[PDB]
Write a protein that binds this DNA or RNA. Structure first.
Ligand SMILES: [Mg+2]
Ligand SMILES: [Mg+2]
Ligand SMILES: [Mg+2]
Ligand SMILES: [Mg+2]
Ligand SMILES: [Mg+2]
Ligand SMILES: [Mg+2]
Length: 306
RNA sequence: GCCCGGAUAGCUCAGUCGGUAGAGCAGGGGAUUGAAAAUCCCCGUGUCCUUGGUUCGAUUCCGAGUCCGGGCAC
């Protein structure tokens, strides 16, 4: 029953600023919960905290992967669980910060044990999709596992491939393995969510930030990655907002003005989904990004002195 | 100045053999178990620029005006 804090929130919601200000009055250690901040070399498009901020408040799980190696909600959970153990072992409190809700969830509720990704069976699935379409595969999942086929839409290639993969590797069906649940988070958690008061102030912040990034050398950063020659668009790192568009721009597929437009829209569509996650998230305390930055007080009380 | 194209959804455009119109993008909502900043589901009424003419009926055809792209000319 150790204590832990979750500081969730969409992009451009001032999450980071709040976490370090909290580090000031609470014995907390920061753990980054972000599928893109894990990459080395991806610093400005990911809104990664700068060296000075990191100097003040060290973050765990930052720069732990090369953009060529994918991460997962499961690896995060493992690494997070371990990091939390270390932190609480030192008499302090884990403060998990980020906007990757699926990770927060996997950590909180756990994940039913399933086989990890197998490049080989996925290549075979991709090949059969190019030949017969994702339809033949959905019709095949329908035979072996129809609970899943009713949930997964025939147009969702990621989930479809995933449900077949699990079966082709284990022989056991996806709905069957998921009957066994994962280990819940053995902590007492205080969950907070912070966002600007209006959807449109969020949009303004997203737009002005994108421009600050371009002004800070974002293009140069993405080019260094483009020049490596070993990265591609089926990699999570290259599909990150901003990066995917800039990649299209470097490839000569779109113009500069067009890249800026799509990056901003992509960032807004991302924010919109993060809010969809937070809506209905159980036990969440809402805070406000706009000036109520002095929201550390609501935190202060919900968590009470520690 | 003259000629030729455009002008229809917040943007880029289709379309209507004349019976008041629909895609994509933007935007909104919702899913979400090892790629998740991903992947996917659902939501389309707008003076069809204006004005005359023909017509039961015009955004649609024809004239004219206005604005926007080009071209010709100075
Ligand atoms: Mg047209
Ligand atoms: Mg007709
Ligand atoms: Mg309509
Ligand atoms: Mg949309
Ligand atoms: Mg008329
Ligand atoms: Mg007319």
């Amino acid at each position: 029953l150790p204590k832990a804090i979750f500081l969730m929130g969409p992009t451009a919601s001032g999450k980071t600023a709040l976490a370090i200000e909290l580090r000031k009055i609470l014995p907390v250690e920061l753990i980054s919960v972000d599928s893109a901040l894990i990459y080395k070399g991806m610093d400005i498009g990911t809104a990664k905290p700068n060296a000075e901020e990191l100097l003040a408040a060290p973050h765990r799980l930052l720069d732990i992967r090369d953009p060529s190696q994918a991460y997962s909600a499961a690896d995060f959970r493992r690494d997070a669980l371990a990091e939390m153990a270390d932190i609480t072992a030192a008499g302090r409190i884990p403060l998990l910060v980020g906007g990757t809700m699926l990770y927060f969830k996997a950590l909180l509720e756990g994940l039913s044990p399933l086989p990890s990704a197998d490049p080989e069976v996925r290549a075979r699935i991709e090949q059969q999709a190019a030949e017969q379409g994702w339809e033949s595969l959905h019709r095949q999942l329908q035979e072996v596992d129809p609970v899943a086929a009713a949930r997964i839409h025939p147009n969702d290639p990621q989930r479809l491939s995933r449900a077949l993969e699990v079966f082709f590797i284990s022989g056991k069906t996806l709905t069957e393995l998921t009957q066994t649940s994962g280990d819940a988070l053995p902590y007492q958690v205080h969950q907070f969510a912070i966002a600007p008061a209006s959807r449109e102030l969020l949009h303004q912040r997203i737009e002005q930030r994108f421009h600050q990034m371009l002004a800070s050398g974002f293009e140069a950063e993405v080019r260094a990655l483009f020049a490596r020659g070993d990265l591609h668009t089926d990699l999570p790192s290259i599909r990150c907002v901003g990066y995917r568009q800039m990649w299209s721009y470097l490839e000569g597929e779109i113009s500069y003005d067009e890249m800026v437009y799509r990056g901003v829209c992509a960032t807004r569509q991302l924010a919109k989904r993060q809010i969809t996650w937070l809506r209905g998230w159980e036990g969440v305390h809402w805070l406000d990004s706009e000036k109520p930055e002095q929201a550390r007080d609501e935190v202060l009380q919900v968590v009470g002195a520690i």
